[PDB]
Amino acid sequence: RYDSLLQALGNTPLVGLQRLSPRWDDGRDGPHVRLWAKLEDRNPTGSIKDRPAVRMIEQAEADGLLRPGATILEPTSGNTGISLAMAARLKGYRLICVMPENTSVERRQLLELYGAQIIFSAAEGGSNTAVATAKELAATNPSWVMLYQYGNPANTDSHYCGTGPELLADLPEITHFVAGLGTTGTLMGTGRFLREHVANVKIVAAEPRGFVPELYDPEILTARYSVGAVDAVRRTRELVHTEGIFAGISTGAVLHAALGVGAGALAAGERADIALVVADAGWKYLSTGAYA
Amino acid sequence: RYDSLLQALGNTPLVGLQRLSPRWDDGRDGPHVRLWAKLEDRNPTGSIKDRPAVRMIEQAEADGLLRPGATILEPTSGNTGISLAMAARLKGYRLICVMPENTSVERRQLLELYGAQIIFSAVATAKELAATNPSWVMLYQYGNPANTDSHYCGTGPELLADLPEITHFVAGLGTTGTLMGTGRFLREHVANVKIVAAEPRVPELYDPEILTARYSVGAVDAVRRTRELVHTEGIFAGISTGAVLHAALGVGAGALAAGERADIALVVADAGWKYLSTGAY
Ligand SMILES: O=C(Nc1cccc(C(=O)O)c1)Nc1ccc(Cl)c(Cl)c1
Ligand SMILES: O=C(Nc1cccc(C(=O)O)c1)Nc1ccc(Cl)c(Cl)c1
Ligand SMILES: *Cc1c(COP(=O)(O)O)cnc(C)c1O
Ligand SMILES: *Cc1c(COP(=O)(O)O)cnc(C)c1O
């Protein structure tokens, strides 16, 4: 049991995808190629961002960067903002988010429900514009505390100390780890941990079809897949149809990459155990029509 | 690790509500009065109905009542239908849900995404259709003892294991499975434990002996409490949780006024996602 929602975080289930996996059982045709889904919607606000959000705040608190009642400022496409907003309610901080104006209405509603102030940056330039806008706001008011999810090592550390160790415990036979590439925390932290323990482990990024996050270490990745929106939608729908998991759009892209890695292993007669991140659920994407 | 999403069900967390509790810590004014929230949104389709749904299906399979490719029929306001739809997808059954009109659109969207067929306007309608089509399987959540069993065998034990000092259990009263199953378990194991319903202001599962209290809760109070929970504890709960929290706070204020220790467990049956379209948030 836990003393607050903040602690009911991580230790997420890993579920074998027996129908979607290229080959679930070993046999006469060759070795198994299995997919394993780590369900990061089993978290306080329903996404993986709860891990770095909470660790970024707590580390900021430890470093004396946050006095009680402080106002936090963060550029976000939504998930990090929501996680931070939750954490800010339990810890007594105010929150200002800079979010692109072309984000789903669900994200907006949930941030307002948590009492975050939202500044909607121009759609054009997307997250680059959000980040640049937040830097301009940080400079107009230095009392505001920007944790900076694209450069804060506590982001990466949450996956190094959490996501990675959880994966190795549940899946010591892991051959591949597949996840989306955004802040880069998930892949950098989980990947660094897994490469220290698992000999020839492959770390595979899925990214949408500039601005390089400061967290990014190019030596960590084996490969990067670019996935178009149509394939991401297709795989998201396919995951709920075949395995019952109602995931967000990034999971479709990750799945697309993982099935590619999977098809490659199968065609080469190689055993594979491919862990893939389900970073959030489908709820915040319903208004997009992608599940229609 | 798990083999299927169906297995990643239950063993939900219990979270202390330090801010909303009448008194978290023992002090000179008297003993603690604690609220503990069991997060049943941490489940395959995001609600407590995953427990009875999966158990009803698996019990119908073992009993031989349910054969490959069968059509399943169920009257539902959404949560049960969603749970069944997910499980029917995995197990290869067709699902028809009989629902009221004015169900939130998020419900219909997720039902259709899982491939469920929706028929509007619910129990009587389902019963007629089932009678007309004897090969359809109507599990019937209002009277199937696998619903209650799912809580007697899951929710109850998990709660006792995490909260052996429990004095009260509070939940919504719908099919009555949660309170009958959890409540019977708790009353058979914990001396003088109290079992408290919240209902909005008769299923064959209901047993009049189990409940020690029941509170009717108005919509405005339910909404207020739901909003209060998210503002104060960070938990984004559905509306039933508001009503449940209303009852739990009432019971907690009683214990505080009486100077008695209380450890009150309450069910968060689902999250807020499906209720955004209602404006309540
Ligand atoms: O990278 C993200 N999300 C993201 C990145 C950085 C910050 C945030 C945030 O919630 O603030 C979200 N999603 C993602 C990542 C990769 C792919 Cl392929 C797709 Cl489709 C989506
Ligand atoms: O009882 C329900 N929901 C319910 C009952 C029966 C069936 C279903 C279903 O998902 O089909 C849902 N919710 C509930 C229960 C108690 C209160 Cl006070 C409030 Cl506000 C809501
Ligand atoms: C953040 C996020 C990602 C990418 O994770 P990073 O650790 O930021 O690279 C993928 N999908 C979703 C839904 C996210 O919120
Ligand atoms: C079913 C349900 C309840 C009531 O539980 P029963 O076991 O049916 O009495 C309460 N809240 C929500 C959100 C539900 O789906």
Q: Concatenated DSSP letters for B75-89? A: E-SSHHHHHHHHHHH
Q: CA B240, CA B81: separation in Å to the nearest integer?
A: 17
Beta strands in chain A (DSSP E): 14-16, 33-39, 71-75, 94-100, 117-121, 145-146, 176-180, 202-208, 223-227, 272-278
Counting every residue written for chain A, the total comes to: 292
Strands A33-39, A71-75: pairing kind: unpaired
Specify the DSSP class assigned to residue B154.
I
- For chain A, count helices (H), then strands (E): 9, 10
Q: CA A172, CA A151: separation in Å to the nearest integer?
A: 30
A183 lines ligand 3 (CB under 6 A): yes
CB-CB contact of B262 with B208 (8 Å): no
CA nearest neighbour of A208 among A23, A77, A90: A77
CB-CB contact of A4 with B18 (8 Å): yes
CB-CB contact of B169 with B265 (8 Å): yes
Which residues have any ligand 1 atom within 6 Å of their CB?
Answer: A 49, 76-80, 180-183, 206-208, 227, 232, 249-250, 253
Angstrom CA distances, A54 to A7, A78, A81, A158, stand at 9, 15, 11, 9
Specify the DSSP class assigned to residue B98.
E
As a whole number of angstroms, the longest Cα–Cα distance in chain B is 67
Question: In which element (H, E) is residue B14 found?
Answer: strand B14-16
As a whole number of angstroms, the longest Cα–Cα distance in chain A is 67
C-alpha triplet A78, A82, A85: angle, nearest 5°: 140
- Residue B13: which of A8, A109, A281 has the nearest Cβ? A8
CA nearest neighbour of B247 among B195, B210, B205, B202: B195
Q: CA B235, CA A86: separation in Å to the nearest integer?
A: 8
Q: Show the domains of chain B with their CATH numbers.
A: 1-42+155-281 (3.40.50.1100), 43-141 (3.40.50.1100)
CA nearest neighbour of A89 among A104, A111, A74: A111
B103 lines ligand 4 (CB under 6 A): no
Residue nearest to atom 11 of ligand 2 (CA): B76
B182: annotated binding-site residue? Answer: no
CB-CB contact of A99 with A119 (8 Å): yes
Q: CA A110, CA B192: separation in Å to the nearest integer?
A: 40
Instruction: Give the nearest chain B residue to A16 (CA atoms).
Output: B3
> In a mutational test of the pocket of ligand 2, which residue from B40, B50, B73, B76 has the highest number of ligand atoms less than 8 Å from its CB?
B76
CB-CB contact of B83 with B61 (8 Å): no
The token pair that represents A265 in the structure block: 């292993």
CA atoms within a 13 Å half-sphere pointing along the CA-CB vector of B150: 24
- Residue B8: which of A15, A18, A242 has the nearest Cβ? A15
CA atoms within a 13 Å half-sphere pointing along the CA-CB vector of B154: 25
Breaks in chain A after (C-N > 2.5 angstroms): 209
What order of strands is seen across the sheet that includes strand B262-268? B14-16, B33-39, B262-268, B168-172, B194-200, B213-217
Mutation target to probe the B interface, by most B beta carbons within 10 A, among A43, A278, A280, A283 is: A283
The answer to whether the CB atoms of B86 and A244 lie below 8 A apart is yes
* A112-119, Cβ contacts within 8 angstroms, sequence gap of 24 or more: A113/B227, A113/B230, A113/B236, A113/B272, A113/B281, A114/A82, A114/A85, A114/A86, A114/A88, A114/A89, A114/B230, A114/B231, A114/B234, A115/A85, A115/A89, A115/B231, A116/A81, A116/A84, A116/A85, A116/A88, A118/A81
For helices A79-91 and B219-233, the axis angle rounded to 10 degrees is 90
The token pair that represents B105 in the structure block: 């659109």
| DSSP track, B208-271 | TTT-SEEEEE-HHHHHHHHHHHHHHH---B-HHHHHHHHHHHHHHHHHHHHT--EEEEEEE-BB
CB-CB contact of A276 with A255 (8 Å): yes
Measured between beta carbons, the chain B residues lying within 8 angstroms of A42 are 42
Question: How far is the centre of ligand 1, averaged over its atoms, from the C-alpha of B65 (Å)?
Answer: 46
AA identity, residue A172: P
Q: CA B163, CA B153: separation in Å to the nearest integer?
A: 16
Q: CA A219, CA A166: separation in Å to the nearest integer?
A: 22
